[PDB]
Amino acid sequence: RPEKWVKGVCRYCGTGCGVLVGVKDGKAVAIQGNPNNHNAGLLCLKGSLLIPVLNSKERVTQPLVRRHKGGKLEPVSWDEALDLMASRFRSSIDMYGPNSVAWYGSGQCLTEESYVANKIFKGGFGTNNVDGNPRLCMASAVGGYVTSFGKDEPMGTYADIDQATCFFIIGSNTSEAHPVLFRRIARRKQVEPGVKIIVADPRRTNTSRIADMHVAFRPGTDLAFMHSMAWVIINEELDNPRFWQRYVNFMDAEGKPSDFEGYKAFLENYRPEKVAEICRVPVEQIYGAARAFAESAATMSLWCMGINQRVQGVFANNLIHNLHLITGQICRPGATSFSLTGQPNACGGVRDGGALSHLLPAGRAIPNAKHRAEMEKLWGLPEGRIAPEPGYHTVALFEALGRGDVKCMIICETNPAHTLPNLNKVHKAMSHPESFIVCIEAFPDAVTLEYADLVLPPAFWCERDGVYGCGERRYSLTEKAVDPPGQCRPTVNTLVEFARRAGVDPQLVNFRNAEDVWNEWRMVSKGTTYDFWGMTRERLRKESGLIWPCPSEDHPGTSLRYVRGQDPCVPADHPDRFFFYGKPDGRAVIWMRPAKGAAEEPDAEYPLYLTSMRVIDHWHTATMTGKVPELQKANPIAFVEINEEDAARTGIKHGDSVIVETRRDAMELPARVSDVCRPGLIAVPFFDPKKLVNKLFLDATDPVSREPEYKICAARVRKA
């Protein structure tokens, strides 16, 4: 029975459900959904079972040090820990230059933590070595959005779900990975039964059980599938010339200006009969998916890691946007190209705040000299303080750590020893005997702590205040509901003290609380097309999220970007009803991206596709959801999914232990036989620390976004 209800945000998925925390003064006792946030008071099982996680005593509550490598982690005071951290970082810079140090962060960090980490490093130390886990996740979608539209982030919101009359859901297990949203998608098809749902995924998941059509294409061939859809759309005159002639540009396979006829000529390469064999699907599915897509009153695509975790990730994102653009299924209620964000805070913390190695806050870029000056001005730095070279992107960061080039690294609210691709390579990198690794980590079973030289105990979740920005441009405050336990401190406060102690100019880190940093971030955003000056803490305390752009206390926020009358970045006096202002002529761009494959495709010797996936009960590495007994009752440990008519024809039964092996490692797993994986595909989950699947996975990255291709590599299976 609670006395106080404290408003915040679910700690887990990018659906970003508002949460109310019931405290019986000082202890959280109950949790409900925020009736006033988009989720309308609905929480999924994970969300609803957060109170045990918050209450867990299995927490990191004092700072810890590992005197020597391979030693034992032992207690140390906060002051010795802060001096040790600051002296090491200063010493490294002094001897070897800013690029010898790095920040490795998280879309789970509060927007304020990431904003301070990013400033200390980019403006304080003078290094652009600030990256994070959204690199493993959302970087393809950023590239797809910037190359297609000139600006990052969806142009619609979740509310478009209520109006789509077709959902094309590709690379997304919405029901297991975005359960609230999937229910809203289910809800919509309930209310209007003439709503069509296409689910495109090599796996037949719970998500397909509301689909009119499930396209179970061969991993990696979805680019061809989607070009092929565009061919049908053009061929059957289902396209929208009034839209694309005014609003669209066309870039050929080399990225040179082209035209509709160019596009038609290129698409001839993607005829349905030919592309149907590549994809291993009945040709009727291409015609079906295309016609549904184009004939529908309002079409919405939603996609996640099956599209992004790919060496052609940016290109795939482009291809989804091509369909919306050729058909004009965009900038109207129900009709948009909506990339789904995994993490609660990839959008606000890392992407919008520019906390990646090539980026600067609010739409600005490292290589852009005017943007550096804009930031040196706002942040009060000398000229040239901000380096012109992008720092290390994640994969290359950990390679630099391994070579000795990065000597000191902070890891904050991520578990990279468990979740980075090609683990054997990374664990060797993380074991460099002369490296100094500092972990800010709340739960001591995180495997990465086994490589840490120093561990700082942070406040978790609603033990402190701060903003999370979910996938629909929604910035939502979590207020503080409880004191942190033991010696846990807000990471914002820890970062300021680290900076001060490490000789950073104190005017650069002039913040007492997360609120202070928010007002600066508001200021740094003002005038950009990411503007949220209008999101004062006061408004964020009272409201259940605001959606940007929101440039004044009287502005309600923005649902439809790029749309005159809706989006304030679009002049009221603009000639055309739409304005894609991230492109100099106001036109979104269809990209004629050639369709290729995975970087490690199957062959005689490794004849299987290996994928990796999300499972509903388990959040990533299970340091949180693992503290909840009910979350263990269904899938307690790792398994490997195997296709029925692949199992029998190769002589493998259900339940039998098997060896999944790839060029990089081998691993015994309990087989799980179903019709989930289409023939020629197996799939492993990644929440079991006793089964570090990322040891089998390769490391190739999209050459633009530098996202790893976790979704595809080549494997073999044999009976144990």
- Catalytic residues, by residue number, are 46, 137-138, 305, 342-343
In the complex, least distance from residue 635 CB atom to ligand SF4, rounded to whole angstroms: 16
The verdict on whether residue 176 carries a ligand-binding annotation is: yes
Can the peptide bond before residue 549 be classed as cis, meaning omega within 30 degrees of 0? yes
Binding site partner of 172, from Mo ion, ligand SF4, ligand MGD, none, Cβ cut-off 5-8 A by kind: ligand MGD
Number of H helices, E strands in the chain: 22, 28
Binding site partner of 710, from Mo ion, ligand MGD, ligand SF4, none, Cβ cut-off 5-8 A by kind: ligand MGD
Phi, psi of 712 (to 5 degrees): -140, 130
In the complex, least distance from residue 453 CB atom to ligand MGD, rounded to whole angstroms: 16
12 binds ligand SF4 (CB under 6 A): yes
- DSSP state letter for 203: B
The verdict on whether residue 202 carries a ligand-binding annotation is: yes
13 binds ligand SF4 (CB under 6 A): yes
In the complex, least distance from residue 44 CB atom to ligand SF4, rounded to whole angstroms: 3
Please give the residue whose beta carbon sits closest to ligand SF4 in the complex. 47
In the complex, least distance from residue 504 CB atom to ligand MGD, rounded to whole angstroms: 20
- The whole-angstrom separation of Cα 396 and Cα 408 is 15
CB 618 within 8 A of CB 246: no
Residue in this structure with the two tokens 């949203």, named with its chain if needed: 181
Phi, psi of 422 (to 5 degrees): 60, 60
CB 525 within 8 A of CB 531: yes
* 591 versus 686: smaller Cβ distance to ligand MGD: 686
CB 386 within 8 A of CB 124: no
Binding site partner of 37, from ligand MGD, Mo ion, ligand SF4, none, Cβ cut-off 5-8 A by kind: none
CB 679 within 8 A of CB 670: no
* Interacting residues with ligand MGD (CB under 6 A): 13, 106, 108, 133, 136-137, 170-173, 176-177, 200-203, 205, 219-220, 222, 304-307, 309, 342-343, 412-416, 418-419, 440-443, 446, 458, 460-461, 611-614, 616, 618-621, 623-624, 686, 693-694, 697, 710-712
Helix spans in 49-77 (H): 51-55
Tell me the three-class secondary structure of 293-306, residue by residue. Answer: HHHCCCEEEEECHH
CB 14 within 8 A of CB 471: yes
In the structure encoding, which two tokens stand for residue 569, read together? 């970045």
Among 50, 64, 102, 137, binds Mo ion (CB under 5 A): 137
In the complex, least distance from residue 342 CB atom to ligand SF4, rounded to whole angstroms: 10
Query: Smallest Cα–Cα separation from 599: which of 717, 716, 710?
Result: 710
Instruction: Name residue 312's amino acid.
Output: Q
Residue in this structure with the two tokens 């073999």, named with its chain if needed: 716
The verdict on whether residue 137 carries a ligand-binding annotation is: yes
* 628 versus 712: smaller Cβ distance to ligand MGD: 712
Binding site partner of 222, from Mo ion, ligand MGD, ligand SF4, none, Cβ cut-off 5-8 A by kind: ligand MGD
Tell me the HSE value of 496 on the side-chain side, using a 13 A CA sphere: 16
Binding site partner of 10, from Mo ion, ligand SF4, ligand MGD, none, Cβ cut-off 5-8 A by kind: ligand SF4
The verdict on whether residue 305 carries a ligand-binding annotation is: yes
The verdict on whether residue 618 carries a ligand-binding annotation is: yes
Q: How far is CA 390 from the centre of its chain?
A: 20
CB 358 within 8 A of CB 388: no
Among 6, 17, 199, 216, binds ligand SF4 (CB under 6 A): 17
Q: How many CB atoms lie within 10 A of CB 204?
A: 18
* 31 versus 304: smaller Cβ distance to ligand MGD: 304
* 339 versus 701: smaller Cβ distance to ligand SF4: 339
- The whole-angstrom separation of Cα 349 and Cα 362 is 11
Query: Taking CB under 6 A as the criterion, which residues in 142-161 touch ligand SF4?
Result: none
Query: Taking CB under 6 A as the criterion, which residues in 174-193 touch ligand SF4?
Result: 178-180
Compute the CA torsion angle 32, 36, 41, 42 (nearest 10 deg).
Answer: -120
347 binds ligand SF4 (CB under 6 A): no
What does the binding site for Mo ion look like in residue numbers (CB under 5 A)? 137, 342
Please report, in range form, the residues annotated as the binding site for [4Fe-4S] cluster.
10, 13, 17, 44
Question: Binding-site residues for substrate, please?
Answer: 613-618, 686
The binding site consists of 10, 13, 17, 44, 46, 108, 133, 137, 173-177, 201-203, 220-222, 305, 309, 415, 440-442, 612-621, 686, 694, 711
